[PDB]
């Protein structure tokens, strides 16, 4: 089989949105901060023996310039909404990202994935049961990643996709 | 009077043209010092040798890290950041010359210039000076843009000062 997704990785500044999908694409990690603009990665992978493109919307953490972030909703399939375990205010900023999601695609089920990333750092602010909590609060699935040392980065991805193809297909 | 500075960009090294900037002292005194002063080097830093890391067509051309090299850094003279000024300029048109920022009161050597109106900035980045000559050549700096700020080949300020 061959099919293909649009998958949007959105959340605030810093919380690893390029480092996670570089991981996926390219399979690297590096310290060095390149702040993102806006960047496009298409990748095909093979999940449960299914065949797919993953087309990957790096967007930047900012949230002004409100129209252009508008159709990265519309157009996207799935989201990822990222926040950094070691910064409060990420995760604090996670609902705002979903409430955006909801307005302008006017629905209450969108698929989406709840990513608490640099599980590494020994230095968290916010505790997994929270998070956990959160995404249960939502009916989304939650899933800590590291893209330093890789730890949870295809399941993240592939838990998107297991999502919208459910989503599609019931 | 209101003092002038000069950028001899450099494409890959290769001289492109000078762009000249009037420093609006007279109304935004503490910022256009910083960058009068970070464009002589006088301080023992500043931005001779920094590139022009974010051209986007449309919109500005950015640069001016010159501590981390990579879009993130820069300084100002008085410290790593320093407030916002005022807002009495606006990003009215080509050729604006005004602080990049991470949000308020965070200015430090990174700023941009217009290559077009950016109205929806004012209030948040203090405009401080302007192209004198040369907006030709940053015209010509457009040129190697692309959408989300990388450039084509390597935009330097390969020499700068004071007129
Ligand atoms: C939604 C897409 N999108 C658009 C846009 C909107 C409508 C239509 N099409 C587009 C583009 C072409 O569609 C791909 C923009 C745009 C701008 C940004 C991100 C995405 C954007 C963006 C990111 S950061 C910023 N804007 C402000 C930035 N600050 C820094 O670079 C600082 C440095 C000075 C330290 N850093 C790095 C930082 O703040 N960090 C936050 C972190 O802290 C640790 C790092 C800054 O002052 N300027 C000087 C003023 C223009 C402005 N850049 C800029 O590039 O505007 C681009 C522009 C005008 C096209 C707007
Ligand atoms: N230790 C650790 N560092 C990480 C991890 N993910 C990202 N980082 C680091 O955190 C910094 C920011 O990462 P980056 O992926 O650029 O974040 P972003 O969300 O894309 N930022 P922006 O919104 O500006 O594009 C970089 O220095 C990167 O190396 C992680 O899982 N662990
Ligand atoms: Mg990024």
Known sequence: ?170 | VNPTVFFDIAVDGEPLGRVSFELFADKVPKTAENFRALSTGEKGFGYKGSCFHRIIPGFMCQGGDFTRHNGTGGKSIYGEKFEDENFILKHTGPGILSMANAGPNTNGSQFFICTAKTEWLDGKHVVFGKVKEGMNIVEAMERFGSRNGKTSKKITIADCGQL
Do not use: C, W
Not at chain 1, 134 to 149: D, H, M, N, Q
Not at chain 1, 153 to 164: C, H, M, P, Q, S
């Open chain 1, 1 to 170: 089989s061959m099919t293909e997704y649009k998958l949007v990785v959105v959340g605030a500044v810093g919380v690893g949105k390029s480092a996670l999908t570089i991981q996926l694409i390219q399979n690297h990690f590096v310290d060095e901060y390149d702040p993102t603009i806006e960047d496009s990665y298409r990748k095909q992978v093979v999940i449960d023996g299914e065949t797919s493109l993953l087309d990957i919307l790096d967007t930047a953490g900012q949230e002004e310039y409100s129209a252009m972030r508008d159709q990265y909703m519309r157009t996207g399939e799935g989201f990822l909404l990222v926040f950094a375990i070691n910064n409060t205010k990420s995760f604090e900023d996670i609902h705002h990202y979903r409430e955006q999601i909801k307005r302008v695609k006017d629905s209450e089920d969108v698929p989406m994935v709840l990513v608490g990333n640099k599980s590494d750092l020994p230095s968290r602010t916010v505790d997994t049961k929270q998070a956990q909590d959160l995404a249960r609060s939502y009916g989304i699935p939650f899933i800590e990643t590291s893209a330093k040392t890789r730890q949870g980065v295809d399941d993240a991805f592939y838990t998107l996709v297991r999502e919208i193809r459910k989503h599609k297909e019931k």
